[PDB]
Amino acid sequence: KWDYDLRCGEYTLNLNEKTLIMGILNVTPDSFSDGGSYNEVDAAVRHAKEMRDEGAHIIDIGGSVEEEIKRVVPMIQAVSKEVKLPISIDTYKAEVAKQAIEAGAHIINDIWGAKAEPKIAEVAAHYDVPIILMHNRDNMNYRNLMADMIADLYDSIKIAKDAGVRDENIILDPGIGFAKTPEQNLEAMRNLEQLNVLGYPVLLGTSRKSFIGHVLDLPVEERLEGTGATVCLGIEKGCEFVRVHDVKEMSRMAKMMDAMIGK
Amino acid sequence: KWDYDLRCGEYTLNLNEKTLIMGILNVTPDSFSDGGSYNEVDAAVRHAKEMRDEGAHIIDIGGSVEEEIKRVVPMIQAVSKEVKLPISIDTYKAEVAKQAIEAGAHIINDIWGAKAEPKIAEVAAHYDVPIILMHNRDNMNYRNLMADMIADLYDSIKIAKDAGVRDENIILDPGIGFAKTPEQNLEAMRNLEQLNVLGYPVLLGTSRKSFIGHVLDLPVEERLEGTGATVCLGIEKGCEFVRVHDVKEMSRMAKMMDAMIGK
Ligand SMILES: C[C@@H](C(=O)O)c1nn(C)c2nc(N)[nH]c(=O)c2c1=O
Ligand SMILES: C[C@@H](C(=O)O)c1nn(C)c2nc(N)[nH]c(=O)c2c1=O
């Protein structure tokens, strides 16, 4: 089904053999620090190593602009040195993205899908890295949620391609939890397979999100079973990646899903 | 979609509003006992109460023939008195089934789908209780797994209907883990929605099963995440019931699944 691999500088991710697990990295800043402190970088590296050991395939690291660079750059440097897995930088700023790849990051993760700072697509085209274009918007007025999300995502693909991003470095995301009501999130979940017609790999980010809380009536740290349900549903509907906190568990559910669906 | 309710003497189960959770009851026999001892019946009732509290909708209780009655009858009596949920008796013997309904059981659960002791269908027709007809057989020679399972299940429906069982008291089960190789179990999982053409509610029993172990390479008590995956996949493919050990967790995944699929 995918006739290519995700090329990430030194690592390659096969899109066909398994669902890929992107581990969300814990970034508790040191009060008194600008970024760089031993306690924060060390907790970061230990956390990344643990996620590596539990089955993560990518480490996702996130961090005003000059400040964000100071915080996140030391962490990319430490983690990429010490953990042999691709890193995605979770930013929507072209400057931070530039810096982060410079510092060692392999993939851009833009929660604004190149709409906040279109220049980030150029950053991306230039370093030749995968970019994740998440569905987002500044309002919730949908004529038809799914059709609009697809229009919107498609507007991001336009910006990316126009700045020179190759199709093989585009990954899309429904942006669950963004610019959507709780019932809209469930509906996007129900209809996720429609994103496939666009022809790109899809990443799902639902981990611990509020709509799970809304359904189960359970606080943030009681949402492991409902995150699991969203991951399973997402894999059944053809997503290639899941972005999760609870790597050990989700990574087991993914692998069981993969065996059943024949991935 | 279902234009009836499951009628279970004093309780009614709606097939449309949620996936129904059948709790597997722990039956550690008292050495020195025939059946009836305080320790075993009490651990049984406490376990049933706990499962009731975690979201179970049915308690499934299972227990040579005169011995099986002695063991299981005291437990049905205690649990039905003390826990206000339907009970299914897990047996394939017409005599045990008779006794168990007499003792208080509401539903028959036959892992042989009325083929071991066809008389059980008559027991069922007579007391007017739901009967679960599980796919099983004494060999694994499949021309075409799915088509054969459906033939086989259909042979059980014949035996049930011929003994006077009304359509509304038939529930079917793929019998995952029975008479199937590990790859056959995954294939039945992959194709579960085909059982729907038969027109009956479907119950899935995959909890902690060996094929999950085979996939994840994890022992019996490390299979919660992979059980979860099978439950989610089963709900997505239209099952009405799941038979599970880990009621608290599975019951949360079910409920999240239900909200996403719009049940
Ligand atoms: C808001 C935050 C969270 O984990 O709650 C979040 N952050 N980021 C960076 C994300 N990135 C991508 N691609 N998808 C996402 O769903 C997503 C998120 O949901
Ligand atoms: C073998 C045992 C187990 O839990 O491992 C089992 N017992 N019973 C009574 C079952 N009944 C129905 N209906 N379905 C089942 O899948 C099933 C089972 O898998």
According to DSSP, the β-strands at A58-62 and A87-90 are: parallel
Q: How far apart are CA B18 and CA A232, in angstroms?
A: 18
Instruction: Give the gap in angstroms from C-alpha A112 to the nearest C-alpha of chain B.
Output: 25
- Answer whether A216 sits within 8 Å of B252, measured CB to CB: yes
Domains of chain B listed by start with CATH number: 1-263 (3.20.20.20)
Q: Which two tokens stand for residue A214?
A: 């809304």
Interface residue B229 vs chain A (CB under 8 A) = yes
CA distance linking residue B256 with residue B254, whole number of Å: 5
Query: What's the residue count for chain B?
Result: 263
Contacts of A144 (CB under 8 A, 6+ apart): none
Q: Indicate which technique resolved this structure.
A: X-ray
Write phi, then psi, for A241 (nearest 5 degrees): -135, 145
DSSP structure class, residue B25:
P
Residue from A201, A259, A203 nearest A234 by CA? A203
Q: DSSP of B168-202, one letter per residue?
A: GGEEEE--TTSS--HHHHHHHHHTGGGGGGG-S-B
Q: Give the number of residues written for chain A.
A: 263
Closest residue to B256, CB basis, from A229, A255, A261: A229
Name residue, tokens 């011995």: B67
- CA B219 to chain A, closest CA, distance in angstroms equals 13
Say whether B209 is catalytic.
yes
Query: What is d(CA B123, CA B107) in angstroms, rounded to the nearest whole number?
Result: 11
Helices marked H in chain B: 38-53, 65-82, 94-102, 119-127, 145-162, 182-190, 210-216, 224-236, 247-261
B207 alpha carbon, closest ligand? 2
* Beta bridge mates, B24: B60
Pocket test for ligand 2, best of B180, B243, B245, B247 (most atoms within 8 A of CB): B243
Cβ atoms < 10 Å from Cβ of A251: 23
From the list A22, A119, A33, the residue with the least C-alpha distance to A62 is A22
Using a CB–CB cutoff of 8 Å, tell me whether B206 touches chain A: no
Question: Is B7 known to be catalytic?
Answer: no
Side chain identity, residue B154: Y
This structure's resolution (Å) is: 2.3
Which residue's alpha carbon is nearest to atom 19 within ligand 2?
A: B205
Is A215 within 8 Å of A253 (Cβ atoms)? no
